[PDB]
């Protein structure tokens, strides 16, 4: 029993769309907060000077935002599966999407 | 600042330190126009940079033209 | 700990904090344990040699 | 062919506290031209020799266009022979690095698209190499069934009929002998912001593929250096201000070999040439002077926006059907500059972070003082993963290269098997990918 | 000074007086300096130390 | 004159003398075999530091990061056993104590 | 107190301590001493020469 | 003793051994005041140490001024 037997279900398209995944994750949490939104989207400016992309950002500094996936890729192989953590695991649903 | 790079400190006034050269008068050809007195010498310095690269590249193609025949083999009679 | 002298009264016992792991005493945390922690430290943090 | 000896020589050069700043400047100047390397084909012979004899390390690990010219051209008596023995091991193994993607890729197509565009997530041409000196932008439109978006600033770029308005193309130097005054006139009269004048030397099908550039920037650089690289922005009339404005370069009778360390002045030519202890002759910097004319103006960031691979055009949002990357016009990758000449380093260069493979803070910690107390004002930001990018540049949730790539890349060894893991890593996780591995027991 | 105060007690220096020269013994020393706190131990039950 | 007279390097004891040699004079004024041994320390002492921050994570507690609090050697409350530049007001500026 | 002024570029207190607390007590096996210098005596003999 | 370092034995009376020098008279400029006769020559010796370091450092900055242009390129006409 290899993947060549399992190929006829894994290649199915319903392994690969998140529209169903955003249904049930919504229908139990009617609205979670959108917190420190950092790298969720691209912003474009009419700038060409790269100092404008440099001094306008690094001049002031909050307690630094750390996104979800950046603190996914330092947690080791058991700390994810420990019940101290929700926010690293409520936002993992099936591993192809993120 | 917050919009350029820090300038590199090189000694000023290359024209006053050396002027017996044909490309010195080519700096005087550019006009001030809207610039101030001190800010004219900044962009006058960048125009000298443009004069050097055009000057040596013209001598470079004479250098990389390769040795020819008729001016060479005639001299090889001795 | 130590023994605190109170000159002119009765004394007592007073207490500090062993800051780092090494301040644990060498009989009951020997060096062959303490060198077998840096090797556990090695292949988890993955420094280079 | 890359032995365990010569990954270490890269890792010897990956942590250079005394990398010469001088040769780092010349890498900006040629910017990947066949005509401009024959200009400085005695220069790199002088640099690499005097950098291999004073110390057992090699120069110019950084960019593909500088390595290949050392490899292809100049395989003769201008170098130490042991050094070229590393550079031969660079290409000749890297040619086999793309052969391994072939014999997992299927021989058959589907439509106009073969499977090598699908399964090989490397060999896919939509992974543009993150730096570029030639215009790979028109390659994507003129083949693909993609609908790309090339976001520069405000205005988009979709139709290749507009390739005379948004993109300039500056070819060979001899063909630009009349318009040489035209180019410099566009500097002084014109501000370089709100500009959209994208200056790139043109494209050749002889010159580049994606893959040999791709395997060199994406696999080997952030793994043989454990992920310590940055993206460098360079200002250019700054550059020849240091070079051309020299005394004996401008001057008279002083002959070809009258080495310029005997004729310096108190400017930055002292504090840079002493960093490498090079003895360049009077020709060989005057040769660098003539390179300045067809140089571009300002290192310009960009962004390349294509839809997902049609395996997985299924998503939530419209923007969910869209994954984008950057391409740096006119710049190149960064090693950590020496503590020497840092006073002269900041007067020339400036760091620009992009990407998980090329935003590594302690390399950037050399070159800017507000960055030097960006790190020490809160010390969490020394990880490559925790590092914060300005949101004008790359958001981490729209890119192929995600967070755990560099998180993997900052913990690797220098093992030759670790190079093979990365080439094994870039692979689609997709439904028509998964056919091409059950046919090989993967 | 007085060595019921400082941030190293004697078993730190007593380890030094009978070290090896092994690179593993170097990696024990970085591993030794560690502040033993209650909010330390979360950082090492995370990585299995 | 010491590397010929010995099989040894000089100037071990202080961080400031090693750092000046690992930056300045990367030529063959000193013998090239001796050049490696200084680079053995500081060319790897960066990676000595790098292993700490895989332990010490990303989180801050308040305005104080974890890295001041667990990794004992990052702690600027701890001081190097020599000081040639003014580490004191460096400590006085950013602390939250009565130091 | 006579101490040269600070630059945040020059140092950090975390690479300096890995020198003096890790590599120093191992390689010396804990055999070093701290030194007092008297400069008008020390720089005397190079001058009155 | 118990409050200083042992003194290094160097030969006395550098002024009597050599005096044809301009900095010799600068030692005579200092005054005795409260000091004795023998203890004057101790602190007179330390003042000579101060005169040497100021003298050679002034010549050092002339040495490390670097070669200039206008006095150089004029001489390079031959």
Task: Provide DSSP, D265-305.
Answer: -SSHHHHHHHHHT----SHHHHHHHHTTTT--SB----EEE
Question: Touching check for A13 and chain D: CB below 8 Å?
Answer: yes
Q: Are D21 and D272 in contact (CB under 8 A)?
A: yes
For tokens 């630059």, name the residue.
Answer: G7
Question: F71 by DSSP, 3-state: which?
Answer: strand
Please, what's the b/e burial string for F2-26 (b: 16 or more CB within 10 A of its CB; e: otherwise)?
Answer: eeeeeeebeeebbbeebbebbbebb
HSE-CB of G20 using CA atoms within 13 angstroms: 18
**Cβ-based contacts of D380 with chain A (< 8 Å):** 64, 66
Q: Are D203 and D336 in contact (CB under 8 A)?
A: no
Closest C-alpha among F95, D338, D375 to residue G8? D375
At residue D233, φ and ψ (nearest 5 deg) are: -100, 135
Q: Are D438 and A4 in contact (CB under 8 A)?
A: yes
**Cβ-based contacts of D418 with chain C (< 8 Å):** none
Pairing label, strands D332-334, D230-234? antiparallel
Closest C-alpha among D154, D165, D295 to residue A47? D154
Domain boundaries, chain H: 1-78
Question: F48 by DSSP, 3-state: which?
Answer: helix
**Cβ-based contacts of A55 with chain B (< 8 Å):** 2-3
* Interface touch E17/G27, C-beta < 8 Å: no
Give the span between the Cα atoms of F34 and D20, in whole angstroms.
Answer: 19
Question: Touching check for E16 and chain F: CB below 8 Å?
Answer: no
Tell me how crowded residue D327 is: count the other CB atoms within 10 A of its CB: 18
Q: Which residues contact D76 (CB under 8 A, 6 or more apart)?
A: none
Please, what's the b/e burial string for F31-63 (b: 16 or more CB within 10 A of its CB; e: otherwise)?
Answer: eeeebeebbebbbbbeebbbbbbbbbbbebeee
Per the DSSP assignment, residues forming a β-bridge with F68 are: none
Q: Which residues contact D189 (CB under 8 A, 6 or more apart)?
A: none
C residues 1..49 contacting E (CB < 8 A): 2, 16, 18-26, 29, 31, 34-35, 37-42, 44-45, 47, 49
* Interface touch B54/D265, C-beta < 8 Å: no
CA-based radius of gyration for chain G: 16
Data resolution in angstroms: 4.2
Residue D81, both tokens: 């022979």
Question: Touching check for A77 and chain E: CB below 8 Å?
Answer: no
HSE-CB of D398 using CA atoms within 13 angstroms: 26
CB-CB: which of C16, C20, C39 is closest to E27? C39
CB-defined contacts A:D, below 8 A? 147
CB-defined contacts E:F, below 8 A? 32
Q: Which helix (H) or strand (E) holds D99?
A: helix D81-99
């Amino acid at each position: 029993f290899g993947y060549q037997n399992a190929l006829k279900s894994i290649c199915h398209p319903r392994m690969h769309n998140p529209t169903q995944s955003a249904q049930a994750l919504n229908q139990a949490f009617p609205d979670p907060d959108g917190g420190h939104g950092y790298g969720l989207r691209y912003e474009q400016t009419p700038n060409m000077n790269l100092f404008r992309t440099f001094h306008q950002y690094y001049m002031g500094k909050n307690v630094a935002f750390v996104p979800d996936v950046a603190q996914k890729a330092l947690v080791t192989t058991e700390d994810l599966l420990h019940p101290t953590s929700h926010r690293l695991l409520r936002l993992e649903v099936h591993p192809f999407f993120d | 600042s917050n919009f350029k790079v820090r300038d590199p400190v090189i000694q000023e006034r290359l024209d006053h330190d050396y002027a017996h050269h044909p490309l010195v008068a080519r700096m005087n050809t550019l006009d001030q126009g809207n610039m101030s007195q001190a800010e004219y010498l900044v962009q006058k310095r960048h125009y000298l940079v443009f004069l050097i690269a055009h000057h040596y590249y013209e001598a470079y193609l004479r250098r990389m033209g390769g040795i020819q025949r008729r001016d060479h083999l005639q001299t090889l009679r001795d | 700990f130590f023994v605190h002298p109170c000159p002119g009264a009765r004394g007592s016992y007073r207490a500090t904090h062993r800051t780092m792991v090494g301040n644990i005493p060498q009989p009951l945390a020997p060096r062959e344990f303490q060198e077998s922690r840096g090797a556990q430290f090695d292949a988890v943090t993955n420094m280079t040699h | 062919v890359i032995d365990q000896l010569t990954i270490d020589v890269i890792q010897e050069t990956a942590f250079d506290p005394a990398y010469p700043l001088f040769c780092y400047v010349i890498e900006a100047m040629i910017h990947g031209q066949e005509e401009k390397f024959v200009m400085n084909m005695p220069l790199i012979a002088l640099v690499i020799q005097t950098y291999w004899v004073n110390s057992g390390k090699l120069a110019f690990v950084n960019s593909y266009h500088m390595v290949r010219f050392i490899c292809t051209h100049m395989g003769n008596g201008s170098i130490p022979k042991e050094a070229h023995g590393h550079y031969r091991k660079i290409l000749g193994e890297l040619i086999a690095l793309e052969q391994a993607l072939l014999k997992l890729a299927g021989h058959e197509t589907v439509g106009r698209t073969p499977i090598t565009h699908l399964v090989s997530a490397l060999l896919d041409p939509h992974l543009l190499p993150p730096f570029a000196y030639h215009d790979v932008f028109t390659d994507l439109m003129q083949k693909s069934s993609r609908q790309p978006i090339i976001k520069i600033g405000d205005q988009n770029y979709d139709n290749p009929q507009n390739r005379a308005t948004f993109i300039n193309l500056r070819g060979r130097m001899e063909d630009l002998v009349n318009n040489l005054v035209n180019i410099y006139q566009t500097r002084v009269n014109e501000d370089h912001d709100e500009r959209h004048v994208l200056d790139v030397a043109p494209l050749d099908e002889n010159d580049y593929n994606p893959v040999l550039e791709k395997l060199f920037y994406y696999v080997l650089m952030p793994v043989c250096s454990n992920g310590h690289m940055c993206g460098m922005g360079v200002d250019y009339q700054n550059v020849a201000l240091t070079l051309t404005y020299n005394g004996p370069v401008f001057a008279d009778v002083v002959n070809a070999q009258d080495d310029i360390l005997l004729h310096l002045e108190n400017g930055t030519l002292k504090d840079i040439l002493q960093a490498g202890d090079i003895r360049p002759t009077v020709d060989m910097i005057r040769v660098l002077c003539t390179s300045f004319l067809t140089c571009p103006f300002v290192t310009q960031a960009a962004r390349v926006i294509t839809k997902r691979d049609p395996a997985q055009s299924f998503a939530t949002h419209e923007y969910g059907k869209d994954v984008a990357q950057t391409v740096l016009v006119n710049g190149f990758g960064a090693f950590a500059v020496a503590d020497r000449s840092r006073e002269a380093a900041e007067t020339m260069f400036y760091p620009v972070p992009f990407n998980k493979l090329y935003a590594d803070p302690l390399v950037a910690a050399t070159l800017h003082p507000l960055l030097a107390n960006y790190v020490t004002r809160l010390p969490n930001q020394r990880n490559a993963v925790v590092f914060n990018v300005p949101s004008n540049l790359m958001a981490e949730y729209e890119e192929w290269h995600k967070s755990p790539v560099a998180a993997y890349a900052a913990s690797c060894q220098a093992t030759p098997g670790a190079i093979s893991a990365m080439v094994s890593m870039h692979q689609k996780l997709s439904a028509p990918s998964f056919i091409c591995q059950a046919k090989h027991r993967m």
